[PDB]
Enzyme design. Structure first.
Site, mmCIF file in Angstrom:
data_model
loop_
_atom_site.group_PDB
_atom_site.id
_atom_site.type_symbol
_atom_site.label_atom_id
_atom_site.label_comp_id
_atom_site.label_asym_id
_atom_site.label_seq_id
_atom_site.Cartn_x
_atom_site.Cartn_y
_atom_site.Cartn_z
ATOM 1 N N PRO A 38 34.664 44.305 55.120
ATOM 2 C CA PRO A 38 34.390 43.629 54.283
ATOM 3 C C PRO A 38 35.612 43.509 53.700
ATOM 4 O O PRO A 38 36.730 43.879 53.369
ATOM 5 C CB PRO A 38 33.853 44.519 53.670
ATOM 6 C CG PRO A 38 33.562 45.582 54.248
ATOM 7 C CD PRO A 38 34.217 45.895 55.042
ATOM 8 N N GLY B 69 38.697 39.721 47.289
ATOM 9 C CA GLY B 69 39.226 39.002 46.953
ATOM 10 C C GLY B 69 40.436 39.014 47.951
ATOM 11 O O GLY B 69 41.590 38.244 47.670
ATOM 12 N N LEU C 168 43.038 40.047 38.470
ATOM 13 C CA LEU C 168 41.921 39.909 38.413
ATOM 14 C C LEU C 168 41.714 38.938 38.481
ATOM 15 O O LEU C 168 40.190 38.570 38.468
ATOM 16 C CB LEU C 168 41.473 40.632 37.056
ATOM 17 C CG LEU C 168 42.027 39.870 35.356
ATOM 18 C CD1 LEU C 168 41.473 38.816 35.216
ATOM 19 C CD2 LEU C 168 41.764 40.424 33.985
ATOM 20 N N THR D 94 36.974 41.747 43.101
ATOM 21 C CA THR D 94 36.246 41.806 42.847
ATOM 22 C C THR D 94 35.250 43.321 42.373
ATOM 23 O O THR D 94 36.028 44.561 43.164
ATOM 24 C CB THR D 94 35.336 40.963 43.919
ATOM 25 O OG1 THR D 94 35.757 42.091 45.473
ATOM 26 C CG2 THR D 94 36.028 39.768 44.232
ATOM 27 N N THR E 8 34.822 51.709 54.329
ATOM 28 C CA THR E 8 34.765 52.679 55.675
ATOM 29 C C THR E 8 33.165 52.792 56.123
ATOM 30 O O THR E 8 33.354 53.469 56.882
ATOM 31 C CB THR E 8 35.442 53.385 56.012
ATOM 32 O OG1 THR E 8 35.522 54.544 54.900
ATOM 33 C CG2 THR E 8 37.030 53.347 55.714
ATOM 34 N N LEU E 9 32.544 52.796 55.443
ATOM 35 C CA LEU E 9 31.060 52.978 55.014
ATOM 36 C C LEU E 9 29.928 51.876 54.869
ATOM 37 O O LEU E 9 28.981 52.388 56.168
ATOM 38 C CB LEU E 9 31.071 54.202 54.024
ATOM 39 C CG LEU E 9 31.797 55.355 53.800
ATOM 40 C CD1 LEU E 9 31.437 56.415 52.971
ATOM 41 C CD2 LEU E 9 31.361 55.909 55.556
ATOM 42 N N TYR F 224 55.488 53.165 37.117
ATOM 43 C CA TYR F 224 54.928 52.188 39.106
ATOM 44 C C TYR F 224 56.860 52.487 38.659
ATOM 45 O O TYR F 224 57.639 52.588 37.525
ATOM 46 C CB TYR F 224 54.187 51.098 37.757
ATOM 47 C CG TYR F 224 53.695 50.207 38.276
ATOM 48 C CD1 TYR F 224 53.707 49.460 39.597
ATOM 49 C CD2 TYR F 224 52.214 50.440 38.276
ATOM 50 C CE1 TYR F 224 53.054 48.348 40.148
ATOM 51 C CE2 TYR F 224 51.188 49.512 38.387
ATOM 52 C CZ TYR F 224 51.694 49.088 39.186
ATOM 53 O OH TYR F 224 50.040 48.053 39.817
#
Ligand SMILES: Cc1cc2nc3c(=O)[nH]c(=O)nc-3n(C[C@H](O)[C@H](O)[C@H](O)COP(=O)(O)OP(=O)(O)OC[C@H]3O[C@@H](n4cnc5c(N)ncnc54)[C@H](O)[C@@H]3O)c2cc1C
Ligand SMILES: Cc1cc2nc3c(=O)[nH]c(=O)nc-3n(C[C@H](O)[C@H](O)[C@H](O)COP(=O)(O)OP(=O)(O)OC[C@H]3O[C@@H](n4cnc5c(N)ncnc54)[C@H](O)[C@@H]3O)c2cc1C
Ligand SMILES: CCCCCC[C@H]1C(=O)O[C@H](C)[C@H](NC(=O)c2cccc(NC=O)c2O)C(=O)O[C@@H](C)[C@@H]1OC(=O)CC(C)C
Ligand SMILES: CCCCCC[C@H]1C(=O)O[C@H](C)[C@H](NC(=O)c2cccc(NC=O)c2O)C(=O)O[C@@H](C)[C@@H]1OC(=O)CC(C)C
Lengths: 547, 551
Positions: free
Chosen positions: A151, A154, A222, A226, A287-288, A467
């Site tokens: 999947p 964005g 953003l 999604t 992954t699922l 960061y």
């Protein structure tokens, strides 16, 4: 739009109409009219870049302007599958542009490859389902034809989450969710929104604001990231102090797996019905199954907001002030502590740091909150540096990723990375990670010392999010991607050895795989595997993230 | 104390020294000196009981006087295992009394059986590890000799979570965690406490208070419930609006599974490293391993506390006010809305006195903030017809917290079966669920031929952004009824069906145990249920953690 290259860059961040360029006046400026710094000349920016990285801006690198279609692997796909796909009316594309757009996130390595090389593997076909039931058909088709699904929402991943494994011999579908993007409904009594997973954050907030609502979830990505992405990667955003992180915002979700559809029967706010299956899916990173729909909390639009700012004698005092703010549980909507180098950059003495602040909520409550925070910060030598300054210090939020493209135009590779750590590790972790970055760059043959800064971006009861920003002029380094990679992975080792997490919000994908088992223990790892092998026994969700 | 029954009741809630009785003046009173209400006569209580249930308080029920070792099944335990166990010096016991004490929690049904019967199955041996390494040896031995382990902490489960499956034929170890109860250390810099999982809430709060800290986690069972218990059942406490619930408090945990030790390598506040393995353990109800240690958030002891109370024209206005309070995110540390019948009971010890509802409030934190908070809450409440009813009335509204479970034991001495159950629900379901569930309870009673209409009240107990926690209280006079447990059991089941059909969850905080298993698959989807099952089969492939809760 399904053809994303129409509006967005196939080989960098964001919109085609927005890039940094040298104007008539020889000054740096962002094209377009999209952002509040669009079209605003930045006189000093050029000199800052010269002096920091030690370059002219004489020789731009030259890179691919378009996909080279002779370099794009062939689209291998079964006809019987295709025949059945045709009948569904689920729109699809086998074009190389579409398939290459969806073969990558926004890690440096990927961007650099788009501009210079090509990918080892990319999806064979791209599907745009529009609702839950399309995703049910696709998943059933994929079981029937031994297909692989990855999947994408964005495509903003910074962890190699969308990268196609190179030796994956089955037909890879890129299951694109951008067309599954409706607010199904707003529940005004419960203050939730029932949404489809493909809605972007910019579009979610835009729609909700028409009714007076917001989610307040504001990751930096953003404009494109999604609902499904956020859930898949455990996303965090700028105002999580008021609104919560994604795990706090999700009340309910629906998921399609090879085994069937996962969904709770109730929408109550808090339960004790065993291990919470929402947390089996959050952070599952494609992954699922496919997250098709979610219910997420909403709030009235805030009545008021106010910026602020504080100067401290040094970083260490700011951190102690941030720590105190957390201890009194009075963190504003946003609070960031910037190191000296960043204060210098923002200024266009060698020890001082600056905190930026954003307060929001009720006018009266904002003003009380503001007095409390300034009074705390006074006790660590911190001085109010002004409301418009603080605002100025959130002006760059959505332009930074366009700066990274600018740097690739002039031989500068840059990247940010992040961690969370206990409060008692933050000072050491910031110092030692920054030192490991410079030491590694010196030892790998890099001329000037790299840009290497840090910032504290979130506070919590038990520690903080930190960061790092890392960039360097690579001009005439042999393999400039191996050097980046090696140094990044060394910075990561350092983070872990100083009590840092593997990731605060970016996730693991395939970029941090190697450290996961140590992070969560062998048994932890084996529990993740057990849920994968039950839910996806033939590995149809084959991105190979995590395990 | 390893022999719990020396200080605590073998057939009931709480301490041997604290029980309701009729004093010299013929009035109900609680014995001992543990609680503010201990030794305080309740002149009107006896009459409220009589009027409410239609009984005289003369005919005592005749219960088993003591734990009979002979009534119990024999302790069968492989001798080589036993030899091996003796070498480790872990204390242990095969005595009936210890085994029976740890065969049950505090469901009405288990207490009833204690009083008048015997359990179909009880542990064969009780072990008392004192530390993490001990628990490793035990599980290693249970793997080796094919033993079934059922962990126990406080024994306060209300979901049949401690009950021994009747057809289990292996030796059942009861692994009692009460001697593994240290605060290992306090980390003043990160505001966390690294604790052993057998420490009780009372004891955790007492030790922390000595350094000026608290967790602020206050389930009503906190005198006996443990850290490992809270984690295993997803426990929630009274001041969760400030301190959070167990999933907000736990920063780190260590678990011994048959497969090995589960543990994250760092203690950062928040991570993105895949699906959160702490949520695989939280709510696992003893089915996966033993929680040995945890790191829990602490706070400085609050500066100031203050009670309050409000009376509303009716319940429904009260609910709209709580919803408005939640909407403005200004819940005080505790807020509870009690329906009219509960206001009468409290009263018995130009508004309409049989429609009015009452809220109790507890504010805590900084002096200034408490004051600001109290203004905001009383200002919202006035918009719903809410009028401040006094601080001391608020405080009285919290006095019964640690004594209601003793009131249940009392009811059982006089042919009265009482229980509470709970759910959580979205805001827009709260009013109807309250109405329909209480009515369902009245009606199911009537149709099974219960003489007097039961006590059937409700209370809103916790507010959230997305909804509320609701408690229901059910009790009835069972004198004459041919099979009173089967009447209770069915009425409970039916109220649960009602809850579910009016949008309520299977549980807010009690959990599922074996009592609510029949509804799990629907609550979480088959695939959900299958995921739980996959983890179980990986971690505990030979089902050592054999209590059969959840699945
Ligand atoms: C410039 C920049 C700024 C950023 N700022 C932030 C920030 O502030 N906070 C933050 O948390 N992150 C940030 N990120 C990282 C990224 O935006 C997040 O991880 C985001 O949650 C991903 O959303 P997306 O829709 O782009 O997902 P994608 O990149 O499309 O996919 C992410 C992963 O989820 C899977 N996936 C996507 N949709 C679904 C679905 N419906 N079902 C199942 N799996 C799915 C994909 O296979 C992939 O593994 C930033 C990234 C960039 C490049
Ligand atoms: C009067 C009363 C009031 C209550 N009030 C509340 C309340 O306010 N809030 C609330 O949430 N609950 C409440 N409960 C329910 C109960 O106290 C809680 O569920 C509590 O969490 C149980 O803790 P415990 O240590 O007594 O566990 P136990 O009953 O000993 O065990 C509970 C379950 O956890 C397992 N277990 C116990 N310890 C461990 C461990 N170390 N490792 C792995 N598994 C373990 C057991 O096998 C069992 O399945 C109440 C119960 C009563 C009787
Ligand atoms: C992955 C993208 C990150 C790329 C890393 C490199 C960039 C980087 O370090 O970003 C940081 C976000 C940094 N900001 C600040 O100091 C700062 C200071 C004060 C106020 C605010 N207030 C925001 O509202 C600030 O943000 C910044 O702007 O420095 C850029 C210029 C860097 O670009 C580079 O030189 C290399 C690039 C040109 C290749
Ligand atoms: C353990 C499960 C009990 C099962 C239900 C039975 C009990 C029950 O309904 O409890 C409720 C908590 C109820 N309270 C109130 O109305 C109440 C009202 C105002 C203020 C507060 N403020 C507390 O500070 C209140 O608490 C109560 O005290 O009624 C007891 C008497 C019931 O005991 C029985 O009838 C069984 C036995 C005595 C016959």
């Amino acid at each position: 739009p399904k053809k994303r290259q129409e509006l967005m860059k196939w080989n960098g961040w964001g919109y085609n109409d927005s890039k940094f360029f040298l104007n008539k006046k020889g000054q740096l400026e962002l094209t377009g009219k999209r952002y509040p710094l669009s079209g605003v000349a930045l006189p000093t920016f050029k000199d800052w870049i010269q002096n920091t990285f030690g370059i002219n801006l004489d020789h731009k690198t030259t890179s691919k302007a378009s996909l080279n279609p002779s370099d794009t692997p062939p689209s291998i796909v079964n006809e019987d599958f295709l025949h059945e796909l045709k009948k569904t009316n689920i729109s699809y594309s086998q074009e190389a542009d579409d398939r290459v757009f969806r073969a990558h996130g926004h890690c440096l390595h990927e961007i650099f490859l788009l501009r210079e090389g090509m990918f080892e593997r990319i999806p064979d076909i791209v599907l745009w389902p529009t609702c839950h039931d399309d995703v049910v058909k696709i998943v059933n088709l994929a079981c029937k034809y031994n297909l692989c699904i990855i999947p994408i929402g964005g495509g903003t991943s910074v962890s190699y989450g969308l990268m196609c494994p190179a030796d994956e011999t089955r037909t890879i579908i890129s299951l694109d969710t951008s067309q599954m993007n409706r607010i199904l409904w707003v529940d005004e009594n419960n203050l939730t929104a029932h949404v489809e997973a493909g809605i972007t954050g910019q579009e979610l907030e835009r729609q909700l604001k028409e009714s007076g609502y917001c989610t307040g979830h504001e990751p930096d990505s953003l404009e494109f990231s999604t609902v499904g992405g956020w859930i898949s990667t455990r996303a965090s955003g700028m105002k999580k102090n008021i609104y919560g992180n994604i795990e706090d915002l999700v009340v309910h979700m629906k998921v399609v797996t090879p085994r069937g559809v996962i969904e709770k029967s109730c929408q109550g706010p808090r339960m004790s019905t065993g291990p919470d299956i929402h947390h089996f899916i959050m952070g599952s990173e494609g992954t699922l199954g496919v997250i098709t729909e979610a219910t997420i909390k909403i709030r009235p639009t805030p009545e008021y907001q106010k910026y602020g700012s504080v100067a401290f004698p040094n970083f260490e005092q700011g951190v102690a002030c941030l720590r105190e703010i957390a201890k009194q549980r009075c963190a504003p909507a946003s609070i960031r502590l910037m190191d000296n180098q960043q204060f210098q950059f923002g200024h266009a003495p060698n020890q001082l740091s600056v905190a930026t602040l954003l307060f929001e909520g009720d006018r009266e409550k904002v003003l009380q909150h503001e007095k409390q925070v300034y009074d705390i910060a006074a006790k660590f030598g911190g001085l109010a540096a002004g409301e418009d300054n603080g605002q100025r210090g959130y002006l760059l939020t959505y332009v930074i990723a366009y700066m990274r493209d600018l740097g690739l135009e002039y031989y500068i590779i840059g990247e940010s990375f992040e961690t969370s750590a206990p409060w008692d590790r933050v000072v050491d972790l910031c110092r030692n990670v920054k030192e490991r970055i410079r030491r590694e760059c010196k030892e790998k043959g890099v001329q000037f010392p790299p840009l290497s800064t840090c910032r504290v971006t979130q506070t919590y009861d038990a520690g903080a999010c930190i960061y790092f920003y890392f960039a360097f002029n690579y001009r005439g380094i042999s393999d400039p991607l191996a050097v980046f990679e090696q140094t990044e992975a060394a910075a990561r080792e350092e983070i872990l050895a100083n009590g840092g997490s593997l990731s605060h919000h970016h996730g693991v994908g395939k970029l941090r795989k190697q450290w996961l088992k140590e992070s969560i223990s062998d048994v932890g790892f084996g529990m993740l595997k057990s849920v994968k092998d039950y839910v996806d026994p033939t590995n149809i969700f084959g991105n190979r993230n995590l395990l």
